[PDB]
């Protein structure tokens, strides 16, 4: 078993946007899109992605707030 490799990860990246969370059969279709990786890994990974991009954008917005108005 390897880490999140460039191919298995990109198959996830596209499958997340091809099949939304609104689809109850999302990860079943992502099983066909992403072989050799389990759906629990695909869920955990996807969940990390959202938390990280939230933290970045929020921090960038605090830097924006600081440069927009002085304290």
From Swiss-Prot:
Function: Acts both as a chaperone in the cytosol and as a chromatin regulator in the nucleus. When cytosolic, acts as a molecular chaperone: component of the ribosome-associated complex (RAC), a complex involved in folding or maintaining nascent polypeptides in a folding-competent state. In the RAC complex, stimulates the ATPase activity of the ribosome-associated pool of Hsp70-type chaperones HSPA14 that bind to the nascent polypeptide chain.
Superkingdom of the source species: Eukaryota
Domain notes: The ZRF1-UBD region specifically recognizes and binds H2AK119ub. The ZRF1-UBD region is also involved in protein-protein interactions with other proteins, suggesting that it may be masked by some regulator, thereby preventing its association with H2AK119ub.
Note: Constitutes a myeloid leukemia-associated antigen and might be a target for leukemia T-cell therapy.
PTM comment: Phosphorylated in M (mitotic) phase.
Residues of the full protein shown: 551 to 621 of 621
Assembly notes: Component of ribosome-associated complex (RAC), a heterodimer composed of Hsp70/DnaK-type chaperone HSPA14 and Hsp40/DnaJ-type chaperone DNAJC2. Interacts (via ZRF1-UBD region) with ID1.
Induction: Expression is repressed by CEBPA. Strongly overexpressed in leukemic cells.
Protein name listed in UniProt: DnaJ homolog subfamily C member 2
Tissue expression from the record: Widely expressed.
Residue ranges occupied by any SANT domain in the UniProt entry: 1-54
Places the protein is found: Nucleus; Cytoplasm, Cytosol
């Amino acid at each position: 078993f390897t880490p999140w490799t460039t191919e298995e990860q990109k198959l996830l990246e596209q499958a997340l946007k091809t099949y939304p969370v609104n689809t109850p059969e999302r990860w079943k279709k992502i099983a066909e899109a992403v072989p050799g990786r389990t759906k629990k890994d695909c869920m955990k990974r996807y969940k990390e992605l959202v938390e990280m991009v939230k933290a970045k954008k929020a921090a960038q917005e605090q830097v924006l707030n600081a440069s927009r108005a002085k304290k």
